mmCIF file with all atom_site columns, C-alpha atoms in Angstrom:
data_model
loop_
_atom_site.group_PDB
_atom_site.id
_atom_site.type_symbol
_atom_site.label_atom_id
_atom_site.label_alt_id
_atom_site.label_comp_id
_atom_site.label_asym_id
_atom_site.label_entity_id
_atom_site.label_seq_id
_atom_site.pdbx_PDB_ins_code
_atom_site.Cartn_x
_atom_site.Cartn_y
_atom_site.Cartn_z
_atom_site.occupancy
_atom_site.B_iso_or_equiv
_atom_site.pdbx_formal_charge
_atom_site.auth_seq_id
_atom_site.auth_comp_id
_atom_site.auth_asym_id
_atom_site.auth_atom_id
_atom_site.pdbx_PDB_model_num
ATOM 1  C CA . UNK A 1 1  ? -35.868 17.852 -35.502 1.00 0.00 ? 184 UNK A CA 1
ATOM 2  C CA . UNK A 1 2  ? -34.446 20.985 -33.810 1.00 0.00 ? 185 UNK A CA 1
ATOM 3  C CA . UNK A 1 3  ? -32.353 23.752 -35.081 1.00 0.00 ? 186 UNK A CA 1
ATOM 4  C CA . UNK A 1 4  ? -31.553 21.482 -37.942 1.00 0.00 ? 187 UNK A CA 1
ATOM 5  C CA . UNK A 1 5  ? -28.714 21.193 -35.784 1.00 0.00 ? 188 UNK A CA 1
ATOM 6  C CA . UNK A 1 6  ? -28.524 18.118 -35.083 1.00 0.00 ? 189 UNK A CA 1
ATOM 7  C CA . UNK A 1 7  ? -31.361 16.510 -33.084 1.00 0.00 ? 190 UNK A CA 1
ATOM 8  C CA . UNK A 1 8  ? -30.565 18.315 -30.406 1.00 0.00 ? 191 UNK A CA 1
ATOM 9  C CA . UNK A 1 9  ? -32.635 16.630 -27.330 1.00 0.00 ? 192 UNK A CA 1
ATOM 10 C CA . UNK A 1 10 ? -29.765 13.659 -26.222 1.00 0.00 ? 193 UNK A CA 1
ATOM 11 C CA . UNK A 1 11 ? -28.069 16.689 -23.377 1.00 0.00 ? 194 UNK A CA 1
ATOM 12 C CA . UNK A 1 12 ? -29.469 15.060 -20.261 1.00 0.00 ? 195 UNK A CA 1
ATOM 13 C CA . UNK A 1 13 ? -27.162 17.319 -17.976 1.00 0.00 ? 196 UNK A CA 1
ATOM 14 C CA . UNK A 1 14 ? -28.838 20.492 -20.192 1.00 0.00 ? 197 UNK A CA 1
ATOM 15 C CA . UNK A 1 15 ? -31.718 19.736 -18.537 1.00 0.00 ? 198 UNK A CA 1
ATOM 16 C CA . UNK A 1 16 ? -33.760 19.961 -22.044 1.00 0.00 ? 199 UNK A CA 1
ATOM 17 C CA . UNK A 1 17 ? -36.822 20.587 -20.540 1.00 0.00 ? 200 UNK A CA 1
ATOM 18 C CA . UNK A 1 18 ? -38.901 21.928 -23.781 1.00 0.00 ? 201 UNK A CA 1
ATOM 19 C CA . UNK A 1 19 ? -41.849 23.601 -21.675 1.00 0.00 ? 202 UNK A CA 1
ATOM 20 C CA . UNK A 1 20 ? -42.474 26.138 -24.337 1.00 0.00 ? 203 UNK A CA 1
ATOM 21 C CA . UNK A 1 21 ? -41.599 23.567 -27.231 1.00 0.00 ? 204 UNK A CA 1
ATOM 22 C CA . UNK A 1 22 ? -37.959 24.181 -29.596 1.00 0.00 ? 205 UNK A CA 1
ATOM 23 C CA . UNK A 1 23 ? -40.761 25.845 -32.449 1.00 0.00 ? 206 UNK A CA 1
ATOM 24 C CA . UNK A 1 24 ? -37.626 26.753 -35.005 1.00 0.00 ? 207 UNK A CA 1
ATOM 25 C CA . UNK A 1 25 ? -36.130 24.492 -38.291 1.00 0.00 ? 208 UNK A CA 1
ATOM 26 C CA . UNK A 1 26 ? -38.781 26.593 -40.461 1.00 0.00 ? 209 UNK A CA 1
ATOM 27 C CA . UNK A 1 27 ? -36.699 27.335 -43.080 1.00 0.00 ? 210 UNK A CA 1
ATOM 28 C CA . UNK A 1 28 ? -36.392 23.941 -44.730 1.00 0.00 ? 211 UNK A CA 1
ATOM 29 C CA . UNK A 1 29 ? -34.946 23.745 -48.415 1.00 0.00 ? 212 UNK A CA 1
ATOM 30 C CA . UNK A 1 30 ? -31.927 21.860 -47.701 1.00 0.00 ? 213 UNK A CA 1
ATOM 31 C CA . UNK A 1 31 ? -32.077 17.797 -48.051 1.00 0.00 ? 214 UNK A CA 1
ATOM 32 C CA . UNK A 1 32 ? -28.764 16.702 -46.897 1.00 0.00 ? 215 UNK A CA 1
ATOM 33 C CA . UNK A 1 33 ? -28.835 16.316 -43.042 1.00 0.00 ? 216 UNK A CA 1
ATOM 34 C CA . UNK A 1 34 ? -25.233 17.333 -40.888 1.00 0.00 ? 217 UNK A CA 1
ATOM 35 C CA . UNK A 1 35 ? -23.375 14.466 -40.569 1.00 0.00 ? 218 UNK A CA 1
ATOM 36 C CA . UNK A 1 36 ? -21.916 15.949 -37.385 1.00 0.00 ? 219 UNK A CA 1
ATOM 37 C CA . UNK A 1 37 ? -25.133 14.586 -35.346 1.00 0.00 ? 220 UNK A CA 1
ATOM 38 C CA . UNK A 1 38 ? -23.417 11.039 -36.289 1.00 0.00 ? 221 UNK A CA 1
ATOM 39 C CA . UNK A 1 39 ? -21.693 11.260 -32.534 1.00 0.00 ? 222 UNK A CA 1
ATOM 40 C CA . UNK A 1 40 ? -25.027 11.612 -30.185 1.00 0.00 ? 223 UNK A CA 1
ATOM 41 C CA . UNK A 1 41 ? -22.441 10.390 -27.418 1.00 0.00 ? 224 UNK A CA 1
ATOM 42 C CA . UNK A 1 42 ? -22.608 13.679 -26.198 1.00 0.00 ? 225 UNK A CA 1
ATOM 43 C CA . UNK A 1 43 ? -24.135 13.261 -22.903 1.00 0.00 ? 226 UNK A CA 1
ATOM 44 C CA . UNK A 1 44 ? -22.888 13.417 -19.213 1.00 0.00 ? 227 UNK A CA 1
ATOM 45 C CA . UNK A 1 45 ? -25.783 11.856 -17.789 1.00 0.00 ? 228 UNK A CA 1
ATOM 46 C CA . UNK A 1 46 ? -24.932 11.973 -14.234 1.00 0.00 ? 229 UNK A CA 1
ATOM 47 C CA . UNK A 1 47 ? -27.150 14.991 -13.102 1.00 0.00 ? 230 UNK A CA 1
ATOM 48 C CA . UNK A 1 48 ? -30.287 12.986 -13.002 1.00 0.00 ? 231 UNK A CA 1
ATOM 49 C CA . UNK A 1 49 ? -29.376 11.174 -10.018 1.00 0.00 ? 232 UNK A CA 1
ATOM 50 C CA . UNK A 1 50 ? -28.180 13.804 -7.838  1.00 0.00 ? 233 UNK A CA 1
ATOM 51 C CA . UNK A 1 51 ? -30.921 16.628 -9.156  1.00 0.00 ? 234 UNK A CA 1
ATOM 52 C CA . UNK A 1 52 ? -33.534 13.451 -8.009  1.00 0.00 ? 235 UNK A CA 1
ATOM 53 C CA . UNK A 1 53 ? -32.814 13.951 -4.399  1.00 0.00 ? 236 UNK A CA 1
ATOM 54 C CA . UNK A 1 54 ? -36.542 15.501 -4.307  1.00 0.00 ? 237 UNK A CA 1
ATOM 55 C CA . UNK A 1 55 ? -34.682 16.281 -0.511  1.00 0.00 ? 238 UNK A CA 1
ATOM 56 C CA . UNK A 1 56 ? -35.549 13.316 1.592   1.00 0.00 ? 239 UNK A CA 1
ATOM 57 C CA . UNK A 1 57 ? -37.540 11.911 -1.349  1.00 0.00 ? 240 UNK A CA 1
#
């Protein structure tokens, strides 16, 4: 849904904030979807806790 990439929104530690919105994959003609977004695995996911610190939350 995203640079026909390959969903492109499961990077928690990339901080995919979207403010201004992805706004590309307009080009759309080819069916077949990459098979390479078959491993979304890819995801730290340990940034969230330490970026929450809000400082002295």
């Amino acid at each position: 849904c995203s640079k026909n990439r390959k969903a492109k929104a499961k990077p928690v530690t990339r901080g995919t904030g979207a403010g201004s919105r992805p706004r590309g994959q307009n080009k759309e003609r080819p069916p077949p979807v990459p098979n390479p977004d078959y491993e979304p695995i890819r995801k730290g996911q340990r940034d969230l806790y330490s970026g929450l610190n809000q400082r002295a939350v």
